[PDB]
Structures are given as structure tokens and as C-alpha cells.
Curated annotation (Swiss-Prot):
Lineage, opening ranks: Eukaryota, Metazoa, Chordata, Craniata, Vertebrata
Induction trigger: By drugs, such as rifampicin.
Top-level class of the enzyme under EC nomenclature: oxidoreductase
Binding-site residues, heme: C405
Effect the entry attributes to changing P379L: In allele CYP3A4*13; lack of expression
Organism, as annotated: Homo sapiens (Human)
Family: Belongs to the cytochrome P450 family.
GO biological process: aflatoxin metabolic process; alkaloid catabolic process; androgen metabolic process; cholesterol metabolic process; estrogen metabolic process; lipid hydroxylation; lipid metabolic process; long-chain fatty acid biosynthetic process
This protein's name: Cytochrome P450 3A4
Disease linkage: Vitamin D-dependent rickets 3: An autosomal dominant disorder of vitamin D metabolism resulting in early-onset rickets, reduced serum levels of the vitamin D metabolites 25-hydroxyvitamin D and 1,25-dihydroxyvitamin D, and deficient responsiveness to parent and activated forms of vitamin D.
Cross-referenced Pfam families: p450 (PF00067)
Protein's membrane topology: Single-pass membrane protein
Length: 459
């Protein structure tokens, strides 16, 4: 269909596009499989079409550094525009160019060491509720869905840190704040919707006029007035945080622009954290040796079940290696993307304006070139002895350069506080409903298709 001659013309290899669809039918196997096959078939560089949209996949470490780091401001500043967003247009992750730059420098000081350290005792209050929730399900000896119990912890941790609003979500099985959230991405290729906007962009500006959204008007009004509430709470009182840093600005940030960042952070800080924690626990169970070695490290650094501190969290090398290794196998972003905003040639390759450049993270994390036994879970690959044999541009679970994950440092620590507490009280065993091996969901988000269910024993 016209734009379909580009990679032919550039002499770049790729699967042959269909009219209108592009290579969209190959997503039927899920696109991590697609990416992996493209790598195997085509080598270090290839091209494909998301409908009419050209996407150039790259895998050269240098070229990746060029686009992620060296030419971020100048050419590769923005992600793809995905679908109809409405007011979320203003969200840092979706914001383009100048708008993004000022939101970045406005919101970045949120995750500094001092500000992290001030959230340590705050989580220290929820870490303790989490253990209390598990200890009860461990009594019954009856299987646990980790997503459920982790999810609630994450929600408590995010709402309270970013805003200063303790909302008891852990002492609340029935809770409006977790439920309204998780129904924020219906993202599937079986879901006829995202398959029509992934393929079919020309729809987008119409939907913007229709005020149709990927987030049902349902969530963003609960989340609207709810944020519109903690806002006044702060405004009406006589600790300088996320919700506050934006009340620095509101004396040049506005209202829906505040709500928008809140929602991003509420989302990221709930779904990602709980998912990875699920993945990690699946790994510790299917690998007891590793589970025990980590329980040893914790008891070593934090003797007599000692409560975590910021610095002791960092002391724990093996914890970090476990966290890193899970993130190798399960990068929740499966690909990184930047839209090429002007003609360019990087490392001896021409790239035309408008192309989406894509880093296939999930694929590179499993590449036989860089990783021996790339399917095996092996934390030792992240030991100080082997740590630098590892290319920071092949291993990118957090992205890289200026548009990398603003929430990385908080995420690592948030996750690590949860683990420490959890493993210093319980051990995790494979039961019957456990899926071995675990398989991934084909649709959008890198998820387990069956939830992660394990047996929990006290110590
Ligand atoms: C075929 C094409 C359309 C696609 N490409 C992909 C791969 N990909 C980059 C995605 O993950 N999907 C994209 C997507 O939703 N990503 C987002 C777009 C913004 C959305 C906004 C949003 C999400 C949920 C509820 C409400 C709002 N996501 C978002 O901001 O994620 C927060 C996060 C930070 N760190 C981890 O997670 C950008 C992003 C990507 C990876 C990591 C972090 C942020 C879209 C292109 C659909 C899936 S479909
Ligand atoms: C373990 C959980 C998490 C993982 C694996 C993760 C991974 C990522 C990745 C890979 C990106 C894209 C970076 C790039 O494209 O180069 C990203 C972007 C981002 N993440 Fe994180 N993330 C996690 C948790 C968080 C948390 C807790 C927050 C903050 C609440 C967060 C906020 C963001 C924002 C705002 C962006 C867009 C950055 C920008 O455009 O300036 N994510 N996340």
C-alpha cells in the first residue's frame, strides 16, 4: 500500500507486508515470539509494518546507544502515538518534545536518594501489613495468587508515597482504589479495539473528537475527583513530595496536567511492581537453591529478622542479582521505541523521517550471542565476576538515555523491601495449580497467562 516499498527500497530485510495489514498477522504468536523469529531470520537489523507504519528494528549496541542516548534530544525524542488518550495527552510518558522536557525536569527530583530514603519508613509501615496478610493464608496451607496480595501492597505504597494519603488497601480486600485502576488497559489483539488503532491510526483523531478513550470514562473520574481530593487536602493544611512538587508548579503546571501525571504514576507504581514481584517469586519457587541463598543473605545482613533500611537494601548483592536476572527473562516493556523526527544517518545507516525505531529488549535479553543458556534462570550471570561482560545496551529493562524509566530507583527499592520482608518470614513452594513451565500471555502486556499460584509456609 505504498509506504510498503520503503525497506525494499532501503535494501533493509523484513517479512513481506500485506496490503493494509502490514505484518500485523504475525502478532498472532505474540510479538515477543515475532521479534525473536525476526532476529533469527534477518540478522542484526530489520524492517516491518504495523499496518501502514514502518518500524525499523535495530540490535547493534552502538546504534542503540546512538538513538537512545546520543540523538535523543535532536532526532529520537518521542515514542509512538498509540491511540486516543484525551487529557492524558499531557502525561510525561506520552508528552512530546518541549512539553516532555519540562515535565521531565519538573518531576525528576521526585526520585532522589533523600526523597527515596524518606519513603523507607513509610513503606516500613506497609511491609508489616503485607506480612500480616500472608501469615493468615500460610496458616490455611491453601494456594495463593501473588498478583492479588502483591497488588494491594503496591497500591498502598504508591498512594501513600506520591501523595501522603494512607488508604488502608491491605486492610481492605474490598477497596475502590485497586479495582478502578487495573481496568485501565484492555490491551489485546483479541480485543478488536487496540488491533484497529495499532493498524489504523487515521481513526485516532476522530476518536479524540468522540472523546472515546482506552481508559473508560469510568476510571478517570474516580481517579479524577479522588486526585482532585488529596489536592485540596494538601491545599487546606498548614512533607514535600510528588503531590507537593506539582503544587510548587501550581503557583507552570495545571489541574488536568497534575491528574495526568498522578495517573501515570499510580498505574506504573501498581501494575509493574506487582507483576515483577510475581515473576520473581515464581523463580524463587522453581529454584529453591536460589530461594535459600537469598534468605541467607537477608538473615546475614539483617540478623534476628531485622527490619530493612535504605542502605542495607543496597548492601544486598544477591538480591539485586535475582531482581536483575528475573528482569532479563521478563522485561515488562518488551520493546523500546523512538519515532524518528527528521531524516538521519546513524552508524552508517540512513533512517527516514517518520520511521519508528524499535529496540527488541525481550529478544536481546534472550539472544544466544550475548547469553549462554539464554532460557535458563541464572542470577550468577549478574555477579561482580561476570557483571561487566554485560552490555548496558543489550540489557535495558529500564530503557536508557534521557527518556529512560524515571521510576527505576523507586521500583528496585520498592520491590526489594517487599521481598526482604516476605522472605524473612516465608518460603514459597510449587503446588498443583502452579504452571510449569510458566508461559506468557500473547496479548499486549508481558503477563503470565495463568496467574502465579504458590504454597506459602511459615519459618
Ligand atoms: C504495535 C504498537 C502500537 C505497539 N507497541 C507496543 C510495545 N510498547 C512500546 C508498549 O508497551 N505499548 C505502548 C504503551 O502502552 N506504552 C506507553 C504509552 C503510555 C502508557 C500510558 C498509560 C498506561 C496505562 C494506563 C494509563 C495510561 N503507559 C505508560 O506510561 O506506562 C507506565 C510505566 C512506566 N514504567 C513502566 O510502566 C509508553 C511506555 C512503553 C513502555 C514502557 C513504559 C512506557 C503503546 C505503543 C501501545 C505494544 S503495541
Ligand atoms: C519494575 C517495574 C518497572 C519497569 C520494568 C519499568 C520499565 C520502564 C521502561 C523500560 C520504560 C521506557 C524507558 C525507555 O523507553 O527507554 C519506562 C518508562 C517510564 N517509567 Fe518505568 N518501569 C517500572 C516501574 C515504574 C515506576 C514505579 C514509575 C514511577 C511511578 C515508572 C515511571 C515511568 C515513566 C513516567 C516513564 C516514561 C519516561 C519518560 O517518558 O520520561 N515506571 N518504565
Amino acid at each position: 500500500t505504498h509506504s510498503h516499498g520503503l525497506f525494499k527500497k532501503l535494501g533493509i530485510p523484513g517479512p513481506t507486508p500485506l496490503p493494509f495489514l502490514g505484518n500485523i498477522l504475525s502478532y498472532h504468536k505474540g510479538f515477543c515470539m515475532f521479534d525473536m523469529e525476526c532476529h533469527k531470520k534477518y540478522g542484526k537489523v530489520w524492517g516491518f509494518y504495523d499496518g501502514q507504519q514502518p518500524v525499523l528494528a535495530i540490535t547493534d549496541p552502538d546504534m542503540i546507544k546512538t538513538v537512545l542516548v546520543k540523538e535523543c534530544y535532536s532526532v529520537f525524542t518521542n515514542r509512538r502515538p498509540f491511540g486516543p488518550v484525551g487529557f492524558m495527552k499531557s502525561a510525561i510518558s506520552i508528552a512530546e518534545d518541549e512539553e516532555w522536557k519540562r515535565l521531565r525536569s519538573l518531576l525528576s527530583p521526585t526520585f532522589t536518594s533523600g526523597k527515596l530514603k524518606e519513603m523507607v519508613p513509610i513503606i516500613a509501615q506497609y511491609g508489616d501489613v503485607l506480612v500480616r496478610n500472608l501469615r493468615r493464608e500460610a496458616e490455611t496451607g491453601k494456594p495463593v495468587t501473588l498478583k492479588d496480595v502483591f497488588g494491594a501492597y503496591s497500591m498502598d505504597v504508591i498512594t501513600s508515597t506520591s501523595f501522603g494519603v494512607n488508604i488502608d488497601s491491605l486492610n481492605n480486600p474490598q477497596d475502590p482504589f485497586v479495582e478502578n485502576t487495573k481496568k485501565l488497559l484492555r490491551f489485546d489483539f483479541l480485543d478488536p479495539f487496540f488491533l484497529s488503532i495499532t493498524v489504523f491510526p487515521f481513526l485516532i483523531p476522530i476518536l479524540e473528537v468522540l472523546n472515546i478513550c482506552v481508559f473508560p470514562r469510568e476510571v478517570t473520574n474516580f481517579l479524577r475527583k479522588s486526585v482532585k481530593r488529596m489536592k485540596e487536602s494538601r491545599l487546606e493544611d498548614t512533607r514535600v513530595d510528588f503531590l507537593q512538587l506539582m503544587i510548587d508548579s501550581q503557583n507552570a503546571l495545571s489541574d488536568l496536567e497534575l491528574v495526568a501525571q498522578s495517573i501515570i504514576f499510580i498505574f506504573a507504581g501498581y501494575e509493574t511492581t506487582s507483576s515483577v514481584l510475581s515473576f520473581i517469586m515464581y523463580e524463587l519457587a522453581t529454584h529453591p537453591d536460589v530461594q535459600q541463598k537469598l534468605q541467607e543473605e537477608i538473615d546475614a545482613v539483617l540478623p534476628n529478622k531485622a527490619p530493612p533500611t535504605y542502605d542495607t537494601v543496597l548492601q544486598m548483592e544477591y538480591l539485586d542479582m535475582v531482581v536483575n536476572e528475573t528482569l532479563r527473562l521478563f522485561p515488562i516493556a518488551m520493546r523500546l521505541e523512538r519515532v524518528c523526527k527528521k531524516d538521519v544517518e546513524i552508524n552508517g545507516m540512513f533512517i527516514p523521517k517518520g520511521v519508528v525505531v524499535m529496540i527488541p529488549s525481550y529478544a536481546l535479553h534472550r539472544d544466544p550471542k550475548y547469553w549462554t543458556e539464554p532460557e535458563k534462570f541464572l542470577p550468577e550471570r549478574f555477579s561482580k565476576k561476570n557483571k561487566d561482560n554485560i552490555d548496558p545496551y543489550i540489557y535495558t529493562p529500564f530503557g536508557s538515555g534521557p527518556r529512560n524509566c524515571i521510576g527505576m530507583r523507586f521500583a528496585l527499592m520498592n520491590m526489594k523491601l517487599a521481598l526482604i520482608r516476605v522472605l524473612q518470614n516465608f518460603s514459597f513452594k510449587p503446588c498443583k495449580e502452579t504452571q510449569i513451565p510458566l508461559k506468557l500471555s500473547l496479548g499486549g502486556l508481558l503477563q503470565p497467562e495463568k496467574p502465579v499460584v504458590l504454597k506459602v509456609e511459615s519459618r
